[PDB]
């Protein structure tokens, strides 16, 4: 019975046999309810793409916990030069870890790593399909709407984390279209405005996505759900 | 009223409440009939990807007109260090501007920025779906045929600008397939071979696309249409 | 007549009226049974993406043979500064060469070029659809499962080279799904171990993909087929 906690932006913590965290943007994230010290022991870190507000505090968390970062080849190379342990993958690749299976999914987004004022190439953006104890979590990462999401329909995803922020990522309308393509058991909106207050827009997502027959669990940063 | 002018390569000028230009490759472009001075006042510049013949004169046009560049995060970061004002987006993201709505669409291509003799990462390539006064223009940018184009069918696009040059982008055969996926009211071919040695190709496209029930409006560089 | 030889990793040699090699990872490749000296005269070199185990010995082979490298714009720019002849293309673009037609196909993968310990942007990853004397060969490059593969069904591919290694690329299950999307007459697994074992993966692929009516030819590094 694992515990899945949303911590603002696109940060998702998964506590089970091991502890996994996705896109750990904690320090400098005004919507995140915890500090780095408030996180438990971290075994694995999943990074969807290179942008600063997803790559986040991965280096500091990896070193302090002796955790392995799971990401694409280019991101793992960049992190390797910082003395971070990594398990490289790429888009559409899967691997069976001790805790369960992780698969990188396609996404439509940039993956530039900002280092100083230089833009370093961090591969292509992704999502993650994670299979733990027969339960499937889909974290879309930063992405626009893409027909590749229809590949996840046969997976029967238990929970789908989709961005609804707009501008940099799907808005409410497209996120509803993604939710219908994927058809998960539940959908959690995230990255809703990249803002502290979104109540109007996130409720509009819940209303519209449930009209299409997909249950929406709104999790405020800090809140959890069980699987 | 709204005037849309094709200026060769992938250059598209849209004149209405505000003036916006897409992929402004003007100086250096031997098929572009106007110089930089022949352009009106520009409010916004849209860049689909980092390649020189699309990024073009964005820096100079922006500085002279105090215009804002709309492109992906990585391209806007590059332009920001040149002292250019930007509004960053990414693939599948939309935003409502004063003149209308802009949405970045997926493309299958590259997006390298050539700065001197170094290849800087300019994110992933895109197109643009612009909504102005209930009228929709689709500019595909440089792209190959992709199933993501089928997402635009429900938009009921009025004018679609598709490249047909081949080698770097779609050819005539594939561009006809894209038109049928998108089902726009009108389709304008662009980015065709330079030096005007390809009037046989554009006519073949017009013939082939209209056999599939899509009106084709051929525009020589300098010509326009209304919306 | 045509002799198509698989040389381990994703190395494919095509011998006809001209000699073409794809992703020439020879010298550092432990599974490749030949050395550079063991190759015949090479006329063209095709590179799917920038990763070292595919870009391989392209520079050295091109200079010795005075061969031309066909790849995306960013990869050809990188090779152009090494004094290598190139024909740049991009995703979805095709060109008719003397030996036949080459077309770049979409892929879901990174294309980072490692130069020293610096990651250079090498465009987006691709595959190649090659038409020689009315026969079609699809080399998927490194890629996950993508809905773009459905576009190749109408091509009626004679031989498809798909990766089945997992982790960095599609595993056996996903590779079967790709074969059903593409519907080639024959399919050849590659990039599997590439270590001799696991061999049971390759046998499982053969069994499963032939249940879907697609002939599977298992080529050991060194083995060939006529086309
Ligand atoms: Ni992002
Ligand atoms: Ni281009
Ligand atoms: Ni690779």
Swiss-Prot record, chains A, B, C:
One Pfam annotation reads Lactamase_B_2
Q: State the species of origin.
A: Thermotoga maritima (strain ATCC 43589 / DSM 3109 / JCM 10099 / NBRC 100826 / MSB8)
Lineage of this protein's species? Bacteria, Thermotogati, Thermotogota, Thermotogae, Thermotogales
Which PANTHER family does UniProt cross-reference here? UPF0173 METAL-DEPENDENT HYDROLASE MJ1163, UPF0173 METAL-DEPENDENT HYDROLASE MJ1163-RELATED
**Protein name as annotated:** UPF0173 metal-dependent hydrolase TM_1162
Q: Which UniProt keywords apply?
A: Hydrolase
InterPro entries in the record: Metallo-B-lactamas, RibonucZ/Hydroxyglut_hydro, UPF0173, UPF0173_UPF0282_UlaG_hydrolase
Q: Name one GO molecular function term.
A: hydrolase activity
Entries under HAMAP family matching the protein: UPF0173
Keyword Zinc-finger among UniProt keywords: no
The similarity annotation says: Belongs to the UPF0173 family.
């Amino acid at each position: 019975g694992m515990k899945v906690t949303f911590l603002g932006a696109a940060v998702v913590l998964i506590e089970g046999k091991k502890n996994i965290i996705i896109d750990p943007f904690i320090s400098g994230n005004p919507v995140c309810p915890v500090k780095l010290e408030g996180l438990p022991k971290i075994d694995y870190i999943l990074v969807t793409h290179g942008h600063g507000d997803h790559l986040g505090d991965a280096v500091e968390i990896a070193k302090k916990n002796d955790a392995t970062v799971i990401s694409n080849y280019e991101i793992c190379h960049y992190l390797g030069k910082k003395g971070v342990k990594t398990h490289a993958m790429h888009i559409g690749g899967s691997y069976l870890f001790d805790f369960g299976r992780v698969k990188m999914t396609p996404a439509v987004h940039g993956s530039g790593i900002l280092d100083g004022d230089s833009m370093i190439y961090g591969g292509n953006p992704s999502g993650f399909l994670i299979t733990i104890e027969g339960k499937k979590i889909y974290h879309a990462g930063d992405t626009g709407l893409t027909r590749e999401m229809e590949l996840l329909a046969e997976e029967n995803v238990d929970v789908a984390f989709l961005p609804i922020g707009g501008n940099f990522v799907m808005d409410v309308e497209d996120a509803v279209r993604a939710a219908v393509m994927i058809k998960p058991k539940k959908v959690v909106p995230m990255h809703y405005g990249t803002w502290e207050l979104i109540f109007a827009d996130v409720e509009l997502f819940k209303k519209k996505v449930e009209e299409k027959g997909v249950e929406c669990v709104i999790l405020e940063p800090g809140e959890s759900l069980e699987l």
